[PDB]
From Swiss-Prot, chain A:
Main localization category: cytoplasm
Keywords carried by this UniProt record: Cytoplasm, Isopeptide bond, Nucleus, Proteasome, Ubl conjugation
Subunit architecture: The 26S proteasome consists of a 20S proteasome core and two 19S regulatory subunits. The 20S proteasome core is composed of 28 subunits that are arranged in four stacked rings, resulting in a barrel-shaped structure. The two end rings are each formed by seven alpha subunits, and the two central rings are each formed by seven beta subunits. The catalytic chamber with the active sites is on the inside of the barrel.
Compartment(s) of residence: Cytoplasm; Nucleus
Name of the protein described by the UniProt record: Proteasome subunit alpha type-3
Note: Present with 17100 molecules/cell in log phase SD medium.
Gene Ontology cellular-component annotations: cytosol; nucleus; proteasome complex; proteasome core complex, alpha-subunit complex; proteasome storage granule
PROSITE patterns: PROTEASOME_ALPHA_1, PROTEASOME_ALPHA_2
One Gene Ontology term from the biological process aspect of the record: proteasome-mediated ubiquitin-dependent protein catabolic process
Biological role: The proteasome degrades poly-ubiquitinated proteins in the cytoplasm and in the nucleus. It is essential for the regulated turnover of proteins and for the removal of misfolded proteins. The proteasome is a multicatalytic proteinase complex that is characterized by its ability to cleave peptides with Arg, Phe, Tyr, Leu, and Glu adjacent to the leaving group at neutral or slightly basic pH. It has an ATP-dependent proteolytic activity.
UniProtKB/Swiss-Prot annotation, chain C:
Known function: The proteasome degrades poly-ubiquitinated proteins in the cytoplasm and in the nucleus. It is essential for the regulated turnover of proteins and for the removal of misfolded proteins. The proteasome is a multicatalytic proteinase complex that is characterized by its ability to cleave peptides with Arg, Phe, Tyr, Leu, and Glu adjacent to the leaving group at neutral or slightly basic pH. It has an ATP-dependent proteolytic activity.
Name this protein carries in UniProt: Proteasome subunit alpha type-6
Localization (cell): Cytoplasm; Nucleus
Organism of derivation: Saccharomyces cerevisiae (strain ATCC 204508 / S288c) (Baker's yeast)
Keyword check for Ubl conjugation: yes
SUPFAM superfamilies the record matches: N-terminal nucleophile aminohydrolases (Ntn hydrolases)
Record's subunit section: The 26S proteasome consists of a 20S proteasome core and two 19S regulatory subunits. The 20S proteasome core is composed of 28 subunits that are arranged in four stacked rings, resulting in a barrel-shaped structure. The two end rings are each formed by seven alpha subunits, and the two central rings are each formed by seven beta subunits. The catalytic chamber with the active sites is on the inside of the barrel.
From Swiss-Prot, chain E:
Residue positions where N-acetylserine is found in the record: S2
Family membership: Belongs to the proteasome subunit p55 family.
GN (gene name): RPN5
Protein name as catalogued: 26S proteasome regulatory subunit RPN5
Function, in words: Acts as a regulatory subunit of the 26S proteasome which is involved in the ATP-dependent degradation of ubiquitinated proteins.
Modifications the protein undergoes after translation, according to the UniProt entry: N-acetylated by NAT1.
Something else known: Present with 5710 molecules/cell in log phase SD medium.
Shown stretch of the complete protein: 1 to 149 of 445
Swiss-Prot record, chain G:
GO molecular function, one term: mRNA binding
Name of encoding gene: PRE10
Cellular localisation: Cytoplasm; Nucleus
Taxon lineage: Eukaryota, Fungi, Dikarya, Ascomycota, Saccharomycotina
Protein name: Probable proteasome subunit alpha type-7
CC terms in the record's Gene Ontology section: nucleus; proteasome complex; proteasome core complex, alpha-subunit complex; proteasome storage granule
Entry keywords, A to Z: Acetylation, Cytoplasm, Nucleus, Proteasome
Amino acid sequence: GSRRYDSRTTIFSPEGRLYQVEYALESISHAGTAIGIMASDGIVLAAERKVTSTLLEQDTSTEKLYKLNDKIAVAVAGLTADAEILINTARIHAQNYLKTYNEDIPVEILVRRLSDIKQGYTQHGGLRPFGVSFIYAGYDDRYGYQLYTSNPSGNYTGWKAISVGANTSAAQTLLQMDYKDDMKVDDAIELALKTLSKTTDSSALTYDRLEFATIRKGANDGEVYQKIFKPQEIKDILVKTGIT
Amino acid sequence: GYDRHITIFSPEGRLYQVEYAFKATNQTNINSLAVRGKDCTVVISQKKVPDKLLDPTTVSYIFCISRTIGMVVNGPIPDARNAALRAKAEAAEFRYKYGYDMPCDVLAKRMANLSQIYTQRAYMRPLGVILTFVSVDEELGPSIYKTDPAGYYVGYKATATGPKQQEITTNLENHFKKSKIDHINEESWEKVVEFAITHMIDALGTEFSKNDLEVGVATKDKFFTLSAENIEERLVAIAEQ
Amino acid sequence: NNYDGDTVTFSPTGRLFQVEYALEAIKQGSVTVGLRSNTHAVLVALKRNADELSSYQKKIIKCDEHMGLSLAGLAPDARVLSNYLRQQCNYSSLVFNRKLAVERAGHLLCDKAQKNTQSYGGRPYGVGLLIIGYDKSGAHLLEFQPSGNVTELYGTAIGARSQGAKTYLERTLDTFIKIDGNPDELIKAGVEAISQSLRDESLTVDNLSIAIVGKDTPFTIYDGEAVAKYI
Amino acid sequence: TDRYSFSLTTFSPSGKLGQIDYALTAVKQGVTSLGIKATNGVVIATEKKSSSPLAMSETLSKVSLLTPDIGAVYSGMGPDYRVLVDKSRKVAHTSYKRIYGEYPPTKLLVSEVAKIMQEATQSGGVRPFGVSLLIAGHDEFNGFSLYQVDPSGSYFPWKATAIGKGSVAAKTFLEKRWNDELELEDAIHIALLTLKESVEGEFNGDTIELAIIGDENPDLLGYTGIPTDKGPRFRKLTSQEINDRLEAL
Amino acid sequence: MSRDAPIKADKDYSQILKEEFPKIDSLAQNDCNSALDQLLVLEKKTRQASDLASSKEVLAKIVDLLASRNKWDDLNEQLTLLSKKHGQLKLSIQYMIQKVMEYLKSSKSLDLNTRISVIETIRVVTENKIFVEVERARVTKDLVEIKKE
Amino acid sequence: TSIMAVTFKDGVILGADSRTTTGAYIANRVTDKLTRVHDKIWCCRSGSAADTQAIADIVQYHLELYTSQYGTPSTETAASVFKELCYENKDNLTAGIIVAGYDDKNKGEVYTIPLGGSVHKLPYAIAGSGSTFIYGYCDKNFRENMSKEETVDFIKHSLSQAIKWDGSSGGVIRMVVLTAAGVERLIFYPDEYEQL
Amino acid sequence: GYDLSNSVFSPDGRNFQVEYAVKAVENGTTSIGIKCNDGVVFAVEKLITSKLLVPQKNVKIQVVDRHIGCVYSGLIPDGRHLVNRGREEAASFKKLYKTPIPIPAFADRLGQYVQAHTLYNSVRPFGVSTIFGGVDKNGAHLYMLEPSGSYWGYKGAATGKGRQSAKAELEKLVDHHPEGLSAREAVKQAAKIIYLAHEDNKEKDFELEISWCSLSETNGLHKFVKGDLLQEAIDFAQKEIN
């Protein structure tokens, strides 16, 4: 048969809760940490890899950080593999907005779209959802800098600072106690590194295990310049904050 | 469990459903042997006619896919005709769109992909037949390719099939170790047929008749089959050696 | 739940079990009896109301003025077959300027049910039809099983307690074939046949429903104080 | 009908997508293959195994070409790789030879192939392929690159890596031999020496497949007389040459 | 077989050519192969039972080759040609080989003549060992007896 | 272009020119129109070059599959495939095809297929543009069951007049002989039939 | 386990759903086919379950083409659908190649078709064995088709409850004529061995039907046997079994 080999995976449970979504959150806690903080001059995205090997090249690894468009980038926490598909869908949705309205896509719209796809997988088709959590750094002209976190169920929630991936509990509390609303990009750069060193899956945080990226408004005229730092500049900033 | 009933991996990474497909070609008790001659490729294979009430002329394990490529099948007969049909369509296909007859190599590769596709679904049953394609090509020379249910294929100097095929294999390997080349030297294809029969008789321990054999010969630009009379001619020539 | 939860799985007994279950709908269901001579065919159906404040339910469907079908099993299953037969009969009139033949409409129906029992998730239809009609070949009376197979008889029955009705028709078998040109006699004998199928279900003048087709008679359903001509 | 459009990849009740984990097991049942990245080339190597002693390893291809300047090699299931290499070639042609015209960057192509892996873990009637690929290449933009494609549908750049049943031992081997600066010749010696420890048969140069994405070679293009245009940076080493290399370990 | 016509047809020919036996025996003196070709067709069938029956006919025919001192050279050859072809499974030529030993004794043929025919036979029987053995030792002993003296 | 085929005693001979025009420019003058779709059934192309070549490829594809499952095609069988594709493009494609073949089920046969697609058995067939001027000569001079030599010379003579009266027919005359003696390709150079 | 679909396979190398389908025909009617020199003669036992039926109205013999006889046993609706498809195949061949399909060609095509429904869990296999044959320019042919999708050449074939009773007599009939035999004489034979296979159906009663395709009488078309020839055969078989 064909109903003989399906046990029904994408129904509700007796608490109103999707089996597959609940399992997904656990699998994203296996994956490395990624933290987002919003300064009043920028947004800092900082991500720790879920793989670090004997001879893994991480000097050019752009495997957590992706530019969706020239004002919106993401940090990834979950399956890198699963994340791919939605990353390129997002690129397409963003470029489409620019193509037809001659304007950059708001952060709100882009995230809400991707959430719909996730919701769509358990809504129809018998398909599983991608086990992904994203932290979005985005600039728009209507809410300024916006910070978002999205989950595999397809829901978005705003934050001032938030953490995903491994050890979210510890990280979240430390962020609440130390974060102030008048921090800068400088302050936030240092705060993210300290939080990632309490959640490092090794016993030390190293420059080649860090991906670090900013969106800064120090670029002229108030334009936002996204920078994904080189491996020597991450090493550069990590000795400055005094971890190594 | 139920990773053995549909084609989904186990905690070993193994598809048990696919492995079972190999285990069914022994149930018809058909052996085949195929060697590359000097200017030919000969395949000799068993023909079981258990009754009178079966008409022996019809009992065929040899299907011509191309003009030049024969196919001999070991295993259940429904799946044999099914596999023959797919292969025939594809050979014709390539002649139409590429302007020459389909290479043996490329046909083997094609059926391998389709086999993989039958184990990619989870309600599709692998075609359990083991297929031998024999040809003389003009670019690859004499060729044997044997495809299998999993969708693995590899070229062949010679090959055998059947429940008893280890014995046959042993014989052939030793021959090519004395001769130190990958194809039998002679110069009349007829005598390569005769040689093939001798090795088969040694391997299975039984002398065959003209209706216990059915013989296919590919020479250059052609494949045909020997009739039962031609085969009796060969068995006299066993005496003559 | 091995072979009784699937409609795609054999069965070393060479069955599908679902078909037997679909044939048990006929035991719980209504009864209708058909008999023919060589010049007329007749259906006598036992109509049944839902309660006493309910009109009794019609059990004979007119498919054309040379064709009719009657159910004994589930009504929603019968709704598919009634549409299908009308469609094919009208198609025969349109395309070939023909009546549709009795044997042939049974054959079309048989292979229809088969490919819905073939398809997984489907069901075998649980309603048994008697298909009567008058074509060039004369009268015909087919029995249609839930299997789908069609059988040709001079008299047949299905439903609850159909067994006694075939006893009755086998005894009067040579009587009603050698009556020709009088549909009346057949109807009287058919009433007697379905009285071998009662269980205190009585036959009244609003329980009895008759349908005939002749060479000179259209397909006509008698009901009312006009079935009391044969009581 | 079509009722198989429910994914055959699912999660386990303990997290961790179970299907791609099983598919990753099949690579440890597979052959060993390795890639060492040099700073002036890349070398990839694999062992040929057959189910017959009459089988031809001369029409057996476990190292295959995608585009002149990029090669691929697997560890895992044969059949799976046989169809998958064709799909890699097909997307590279339809999306970068009919749209962008030239041979793609290595980085680009690796991403694209990982998407097909991803799309075999989304849909019904398909479970994923159970091989890991090493895609070695050179583009003039990001230099030499060596990447590894997962049966999860992710990619990773490596400095040197192995896949197959002897992968864990092999990366331990590469730790002490590896250096940030290598020659291409020295890379050949290191690669074959590691794979000699991950083969438990006899280790020939007739049964060992060697390929370099090292020096250009123009005469393998098919034409000569414009030197601004070259031929393949991929170059498969014939058997007799590999035998010379066994002596150079 | 799948038809019964070859089982019968070869048996008709055998009955006939066994009552034509005297006509055949005199014809061997003129030229033995011309008489022999007719008998060989019978053993070109794939019916092992009736080929066993027709080796009885040949065994009578070839006594004359033995009495001849020129024609027994081609008997040695004929045995080869039948054994390697089939030997009609292995049964037909087994009967031939078994019954020749007894004939050599009553003929009291020349020592050279008897050894070289039996020498050619001990070659034939080597490849089998499944039951030929019982005969096989007797075949070799006839060489032995002469060479003792 | 002109093509013809003519039956004789022991088989059938096919005859064609090798000149192909488009407009006043001759594209090539040595292109063979005699086409092999089976070892033993050949056919002849005329009219628009593309249309006939396309259909000929399709028919070969279908006949290959016929051989590998059911046995060889007959001349009849083959004609039908040409016919039926022309019936499906009877408003689009203008093709003259003659299908001729030598069987042992039917000895020599000539079938011809018009633009709209119909099959017609004839003891001789002509088609093209230039072969309509030689039509009357064909029937007056035809004989039933001739010698091999008589057939060769008849086709030579018919096409000489064709080349005479039509500038689109020219080049060499090419013939294929289908028989139980072999398959004989023949070629006649222009001086050789200008003497006559 | 391994008994819930037709795309499981057992470690034994056996597919039981498919094997089980042969048992369906084993509870069907007895049907025989004699391969002749000039043609084929089919005969089929028609069980009589009452005397309300109308004999020789309930067809199991359907003609496919104008020259291929088909008669089937097992689950009846299933077999009528198998013949349904095969008539479409006949017309298609005629349309493309303008000649009636050959006997071997038709055998081929049905084998593919029965193959298809044992390769998917989304279609159900058939439950019939069919016996068909005829005359073409390659000679007379006879084939039996299993619900597994298997066929072979057949000197004589049978199926149904009394397939054993039938086949035992066919062996002796090749002893009587090791050169094969005439279609016209095989009509009388055909009746004979249905009566012999009605000794396994000896708690029921039967109606005999016979159909033939022979080149020496009917000009190579498939027709029915009826009238005077039919009752000669019925009388023959009676006296023998009495």
